[PDB]
Amino acid sequence: LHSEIGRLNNQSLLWGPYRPNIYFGTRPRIGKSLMTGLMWGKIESYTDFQHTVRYTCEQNEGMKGYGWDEYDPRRGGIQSIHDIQNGLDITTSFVKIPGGAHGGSWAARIKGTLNDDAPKDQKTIVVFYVSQEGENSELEAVPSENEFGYEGDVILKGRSEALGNYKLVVTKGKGVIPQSDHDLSRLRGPGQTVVQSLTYPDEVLWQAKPILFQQLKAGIDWLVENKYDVADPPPPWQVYLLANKPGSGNVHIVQKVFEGDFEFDILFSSESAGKEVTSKDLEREVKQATEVFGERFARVFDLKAPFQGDNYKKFGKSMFSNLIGGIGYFYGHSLVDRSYAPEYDEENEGFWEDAAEARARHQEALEGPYELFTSIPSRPFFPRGFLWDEGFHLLPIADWDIDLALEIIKSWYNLMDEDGWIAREQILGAEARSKVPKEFQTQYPHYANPPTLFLVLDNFVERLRKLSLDETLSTASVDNPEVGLEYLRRLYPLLRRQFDWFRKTQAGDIKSYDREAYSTKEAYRWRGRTVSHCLTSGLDDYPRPQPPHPGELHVDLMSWVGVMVKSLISIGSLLGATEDVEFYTKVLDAIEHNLDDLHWSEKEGCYCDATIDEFEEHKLVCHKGYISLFPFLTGLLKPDSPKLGKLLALIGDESELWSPYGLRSLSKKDEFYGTAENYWRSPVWININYLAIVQLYNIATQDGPYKETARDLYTRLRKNIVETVYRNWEETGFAWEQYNPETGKGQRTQHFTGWTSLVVKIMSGHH
Ligand SMILES: Cc1nc(-c2ccc(NCCCCCCN3C[C@H](O)[C@@H](O)[C@H](O)[C@H]3CO)c([N+](=O)[O-])c2)no1
């Protein structure tokens, strides 16, 4: 039955618009298969379309905004695009229709409405680009009856092992199609939908823009050769309309030119499903998905006071839809240094220079291929899997669809190598690499990242302890305990492997110094630190001991290990791994003492990282900020702890961390406040604020000395964080990466959905 729910999940999730790196396209969760993508741009001149055409996601002055209004990867959703440069408001509605044996069918409507500023007679070029990867697969455009192109629908018939037989139709659509009276129309037709069918080696089919442009350029060269010139030139839109040449191939370009508003449908019909998909099917399924989206949201994200209002609901739906709408499927080779150069052990003083030397040997090579099904932080700027971000992404997603979240966790854990390492940044395949400077591609097997995916696991466990097919599937792994347990049984050894990997690779040094502590074992240091940075910790430029030193100990990292042990206690217990649970219990107890013995500063009233002095002694290095609160953020302190009460004072202290807009990453009193790139040195970050909010709530709903302080801080922080993110969204249409504690303004990158979307769960409360 676990096998059964697994196959049903597989069938349910196979298809999607799983290409979040582009405005709109689809692909199934199969490395080498059928992919589609949309392009559009106005044409006003002989040279502008190369500059106006849209395909991969960006964010700049020419684009007001874009995102998902509703989305559920089982059903589909609706995306809105507000394009200033091209004077166009676009809608792309996508819907899946279950049936057959190959993951069902799907359809999309693309609608473009000119904005008030656009010329009423704007010409817009629209391209639907289709490619298929695989040795023994086929795809063919059925020729039109007409001479120069298509009066009606374009039909592609294809086949593969993975998809069986299918047809993909691009409907004629609605809107004025311009007609040219030029001589060229004798050979090219007056203006109509055209199809070019081509082949390239599989590995380059992703390069849709260059492939298209190569065809456009060939058409223009033909014009030149055939005496179409500046004495009497055809109109731009005709110059840029491909000669119709449908056929068989692994690439199919479908091109339309419209004047004024337009729309057209894409209908993917899985043959094994029986009756083919129609436009009327599309409209019905679109209306139905919205209704279901509506009903689920009100149940799962029921926003509590003072956010029950409709403005907050709309806000919540946008923040949530953009988060879950970022889910992509990525496939390909990854770039990894597998030298395990000894310099990477960072055992000496000045280790960063040695590590730089090893990197300069450039032993990294491509490996895999790997696949990953994950949500992402940033469609325009970094549309790919980041390991600790994904822990935050799945907290709202798990609420929505626990089985989906478990799928993503599983996908992440399937990357883990024999040692227990998962790369923190997953750049899979040439398409993903295109977005990343080559200097920043290489992954390092000694680089960890916070294990926030365990937080998601923790939530699943509590749910496990305490309808349409889609509704049923979304909770099958909780509603069927035996299913849930089997999932944990299979994941459990990889979690344990990761635990062990942390302790083998990210170990700090007690025994070699004048260091006394309850445990001789429990001490941690993040590998990969530079003079100015600690990227692996996730808090890039939060101030750390200077200089970096093999004797450093990082309190956040030890806290993370505490998170992991507790999770392993719970899961171990569920699986009756008695021997394991006894070991975990001893480790937890040791971390509890050692956090105090190695990291607590009585003088400062908070936790601090530690180094080793010029005189070879243990020194605490305190920089009041997120790092300082870590045992609290990660749920490690008892509710009656005096230490907790001191952290609550720091948290609430306006002159240190407490801004009107949320908690400051670093205190105003810290010498490093607002210095350098000021990334984690003052701004308000939603992910850490979310952990604070949840821990304040835990203390607030339990007997103890800080109940009432916690309740007040919970109330205020929740309000502050929600309102800041809301005001910004209202003003700008965007979720931002971080928020300015003086002004409240969103800054750094937009489209950060992205853990900023946690705000949905903050609003809905009841932790
Ligand atoms: C115009 C215009 N373009 C841009 C622009 C900005 C940035 C980038 N890439 C930066 C990649 C680094 C991701 C780290 C983010 N974040 C940092 C946290 O510190 C981590 O904790 C966390 O894990 C990760 C992930 O969330 C690109 N670009 O490469 O295309 C373009 N801005 O304006």
mmCIF file of N, CA, C and O in Angstrom, residues 353-395:
data_model
loop_
_atom_site.group_PDB
_atom_site.id
_atom_site.type_symbol
_atom_site.label_atom_id
_atom_site.label_comp_id
_atom_site.label_asym_id
_atom_site.label_seq_id
_atom_site.Cartn_x
_atom_site.Cartn_y
_atom_site.Cartn_z
ATOM 1 N N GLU A 353 44.080 30.447 3.040
ATOM 2 C CA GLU A 353 45.050 30.600 1.963
ATOM 3 C C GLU A 353 45.416 29.236 1.383
ATOM 4 O O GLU A 353 45.619 29.145 0.184
ATOM 5 N N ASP A 354 45.500 28.203 2.231
ATOM 6 C CA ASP A 354 45.798 26.847 1.797
ATOM 7 C C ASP A 354 44.632 26.328 0.961
ATOM 8 O O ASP A 354 44.838 25.753 -0.096
ATOM 9 N N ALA A 355 43.404 26.509 1.467
ATOM 10 C CA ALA A 355 42.183 26.140 0.766
ATOM 11 C C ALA A 355 42.093 26.835 -0.597
ATOM 12 O O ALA A 355 41.675 26.193 -1.559
ATOM 13 N N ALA A 356 42.494 28.121 -0.685
ATOM 14 C CA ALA A 356 42.507 28.836 -1.958
ATOM 15 C C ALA A 356 43.482 28.172 -2.932
ATOM 16 O O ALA A 356 43.201 28.068 -4.121
ATOM 17 N N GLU A 357 44.641 27.750 -2.423
ATOM 18 C CA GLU A 357 45.648 27.091 -3.239
ATOM 19 C C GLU A 357 45.071 25.815 -3.854
ATOM 20 O O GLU A 357 45.248 25.594 -5.052
ATOM 21 N N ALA A 358 44.389 24.989 -3.041
ATOM 22 C CA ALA A 358 43.799 23.735 -3.504
ATOM 23 C C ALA A 358 42.753 24.004 -4.589
ATOM 24 O O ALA A 358 42.739 23.355 -5.645
ATOM 25 N N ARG A 359 41.882 24.990 -4.339
ATOM 26 C CA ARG A 359 40.886 25.373 -5.334
ATOM 27 C C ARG A 359 41.571 25.782 -6.643
ATOM 28 O O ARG A 359 41.065 25.473 -7.729
ATOM 29 N N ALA A 360 42.758 26.415 -6.548
ATOM 30 C CA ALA A 360 43.435 26.885 -7.748
ATOM 31 C C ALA A 360 44.094 25.741 -8.526
ATOM 32 O O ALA A 360 44.617 25.961 -9.620
ATOM 33 N N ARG A 361 44.042 24.515 -7.994
ATOM 34 C CA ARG A 361 44.460 23.339 -8.754
ATOM 35 C C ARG A 361 43.375 22.939 -9.768
ATOM 36 O O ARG A 361 43.651 22.151 -10.662
ATOM 37 N N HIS A 362 42.138 23.432 -9.580
ATOM 38 C CA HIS A 362 40.975 23.201 -10.436
ATOM 39 C C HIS A 362 40.763 21.733 -10.808
ATOM 40 O O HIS A 362 40.626 21.425 -11.987
ATOM 41 N N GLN A 363 40.661 20.851 -9.808
ATOM 42 C CA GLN A 363 40.419 19.438 -10.049
ATOM 43 C C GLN A 363 38.940 19.142 -10.265
ATOM 44 O O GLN A 363 38.571 17.987 -10.504
ATOM 45 N N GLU A 364 38.077 20.153 -10.106
ATOM 46 C CA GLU A 364 36.639 19.901 -10.182
ATOM 47 C C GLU A 364 36.297 19.313 -11.549
ATOM 48 O O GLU A 364 36.890 19.710 -12.542
ATOM 49 N N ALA A 365 35.336 18.383 -11.593
ATOM 50 C CA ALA A 365 34.821 17.835 -12.850
ATOM 51 C C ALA A 365 33.311 17.605 -12.761
ATOM 52 O O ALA A 365 32.771 17.425 -11.677
ATOM 53 N N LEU A 366 32.637 17.557 -13.916
ATOM 54 C CA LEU A 366 31.204 17.260 -13.974
ATOM 55 C C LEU A 366 30.925 15.819 -13.536
ATOM 56 O O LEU A 366 31.631 14.884 -13.912
ATOM 57 N N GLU A 367 29.832 15.632 -12.802
ATOM 58 C CA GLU A 367 29.391 14.308 -12.414
ATOM 59 C C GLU A 367 27.864 14.288 -12.374
ATOM 60 O O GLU A 367 27.219 15.338 -12.336
ATOM 61 N N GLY A 368 27.320 13.071 -12.293
ATOM 62 C CA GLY A 368 25.892 12.785 -12.321
ATOM 63 C C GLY A 368 25.559 11.854 -13.493
ATOM 64 O O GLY A 368 26.359 10.987 -13.837
ATOM 65 N N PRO A 369 24.424 12.040 -14.203
ATOM 66 C CA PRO A 369 23.533 13.174 -13.970
ATOM 67 C C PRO A 369 22.693 12.957 -12.719
ATOM 68 O O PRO A 369 22.489 11.829 -12.299
ATOM 69 N N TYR A 370 22.194 14.055 -12.151
ATOM 70 C CA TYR A 370 21.306 14.025 -11.006
ATOM 71 C C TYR A 370 19.963 14.632 -11.402
ATOM 72 O O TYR A 370 19.864 15.356 -12.383
ATOM 73 N N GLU A 371 18.928 14.388 -10.605
ATOM 74 C CA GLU A 371 17.708 15.141 -10.816
ATOM 75 C C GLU A 371 17.300 15.761 -9.488
ATOM 76 O O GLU A 371 17.679 15.277 -8.414
ATOM 77 N N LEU A 372 16.478 16.809 -9.546
ATOM 78 C CA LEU A 372 15.950 17.316 -8.290
ATOM 79 C C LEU A 372 14.603 17.961 -8.554
ATOM 80 O O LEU A 372 14.417 18.697 -9.531
ATOM 81 N N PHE A 373 13.681 17.663 -7.649
ATOM 82 C CA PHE A 373 12.373 18.276 -7.634
ATOM 83 C C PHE A 373 12.307 19.118 -6.366
ATOM 84 O O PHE A 373 12.265 18.564 -5.266
ATOM 85 N N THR A 374 12.315 20.447 -6.535
ATOM 86 C CA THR A 374 12.439 21.362 -5.411
ATOM 87 C C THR A 374 11.775 22.698 -5.738
ATOM 88 O O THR A 374 11.632 23.079 -6.911
ATOM 89 N N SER A 375 11.353 23.401 -4.675
ATOM 90 C CA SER A 375 11.051 24.818 -4.785
ATOM 91 C C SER A 375 12.368 25.620 -4.732
ATOM 92 O O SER A 375 13.451 25.057 -4.566
ATOM 93 N N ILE A 376 12.312 26.930 -4.964
ATOM 94 C CA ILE A 376 13.522 27.708 -5.188
ATOM 95 C C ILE A 376 13.367 29.067 -4.502
ATOM 96 O O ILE A 376 12.250 29.526 -4.232
ATOM 97 N N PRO A 377 14.462 29.796 -4.221
ATOM 98 C CA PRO A 377 14.345 31.140 -3.668
ATOM 99 C C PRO A 377 13.929 32.214 -4.675
ATOM 100 O O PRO A 377 13.092 33.043 -4.345
ATOM 101 N N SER A 378 14.464 32.189 -5.903
ATOM 102 C CA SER A 378 14.379 33.361 -6.780
ATOM 103 C C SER A 378 14.280 32.983 -8.264
ATOM 104 O O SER A 378 15.286 32.618 -8.853
ATOM 105 N N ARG A 379 13.095 33.133 -8.875
ATOM 106 C CA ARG A 379 12.915 32.897 -10.296
ATOM 107 C C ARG A 379 13.870 33.745 -11.141
ATOM 108 O O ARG A 379 14.564 33.203 -11.980
ATOM 109 N N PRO A 380 13.935 35.092 -11.022
ATOM 110 C CA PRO A 380 14.859 35.875 -11.843
ATOM 111 C C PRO A 380 16.350 35.718 -11.571
ATOM 112 O O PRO A 380 17.128 35.764 -12.522
ATOM 113 N N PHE A 381 16.744 35.456 -10.315
ATOM 114 C CA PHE A 381 18.158 35.581 -9.985
ATOM 115 C C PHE A 381 18.862 34.278 -9.580
ATOM 116 O O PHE A 381 20.070 34.198 -9.737
ATOM 117 N N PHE A 382 18.171 33.300 -8.976
ATOM 118 C CA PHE A 382 18.846 32.053 -8.652
ATOM 119 C C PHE A 382 17.822 30.920 -8.577
ATOM 120 O O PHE A 382 17.423 30.486 -7.487
ATOM 121 N N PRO A 383 17.267 30.512 -9.738
ATOM 122 C CA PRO A 383 16.144 29.580 -9.750
ATOM 123 C C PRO A 383 16.661 28.160 -9.598
ATOM 124 O O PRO A 383 16.656 27.407 -10.552
ATOM 125 N N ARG A 384 17.039 27.787 -8.374
ATOM 126 C CA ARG A 384 17.598 26.457 -8.191
ATOM 127 C C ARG A 384 17.602 26.142 -6.703
ATOM 128 O O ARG A 384 17.381 27.032 -5.872
ATOM 129 N N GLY A 385 17.859 24.864 -6.409
ATOM 130 C CA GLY A 385 17.713 24.326 -5.067
ATOM 131 C C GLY A 385 18.851 24.816 -4.179
ATOM 132 O O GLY A 385 20.002 24.690 -4.583
ATOM 133 N N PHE A 386 18.502 25.374 -3.009
ATOM 134 C CA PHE A 386 19.449 25.681 -1.944
ATOM 135 C C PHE A 386 19.010 24.918 -0.699
ATOM 136 O O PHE A 386 17.821 24.887 -0.391
ATOM 137 N N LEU A 387 19.965 24.266 -0.019
ATOM 138 C CA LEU A 387 19.634 23.204 0.936
ATOM 139 C C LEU A 387 18.936 23.769 2.176
ATOM 140 O O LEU A 387 17.867 23.291 2.541
ATOM 141 N N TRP A 388 19.498 24.785 2.851
ATOM 142 C CA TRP A 388 18.767 25.267 4.035
ATOM 143 C C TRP A 388 17.535 26.122 3.714
ATOM 144 O O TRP A 388 16.580 26.141 4.501
ATOM 145 N N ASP A 389 17.539 26.819 2.564
ATOM 146 C CA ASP A 389 16.330 27.518 2.141
ATOM 147 C C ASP A 389 15.188 26.508 2.060
ATOM 148 O O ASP A 389 14.067 26.794 2.477
ATOM 149 N N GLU A 390 15.472 25.310 1.536
ATOM 150 C CA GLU A 390 14.354 24.417 1.236
ATOM 151 C C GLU A 390 13.632 23.953 2.503
ATOM 152 O O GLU A 390 12.436 23.661 2.462
ATOM 153 N N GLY A 391 14.363 23.877 3.619
ATOM 154 C CA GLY A 391 13.756 23.628 4.915
ATOM 155 C C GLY A 391 12.657 24.642 5.239
ATOM 156 O O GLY A 391 11.632 24.278 5.794
ATOM 157 N N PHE A 392 12.873 25.922 4.908
ATOM 158 C CA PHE A 392 11.887 26.955 5.193
ATOM 159 C C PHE A 392 10.750 26.913 4.180
ATOM 160 O O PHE A 392 9.598 27.049 4.574
ATOM 161 N N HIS A 393 11.077 26.712 2.890
ATOM 162 C CA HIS A 393 10.107 26.628 1.818
ATOM 163 C C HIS A 393 9.036 25.591 2.141
ATOM 164 O O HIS A 393 7.865 25.838 1.853
ATOM 165 N N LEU A 394 9.431 24.435 2.703
ATOM 166 C CA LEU A 394 8.492 23.324 2.828
ATOM 167 C C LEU A 394 7.591 23.486 4.059
ATOM 168 O O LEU A 394 6.639 22.723 4.237
ATOM 169 N N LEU A 395 7.868 24.458 4.937
ATOM 170 C CA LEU A 395 6.981 24.535 6.091
ATOM 171 C C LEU A 395 5.575 24.933 5.648
ATOM 172 O O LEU A 395 4.605 24.263 5.981
#
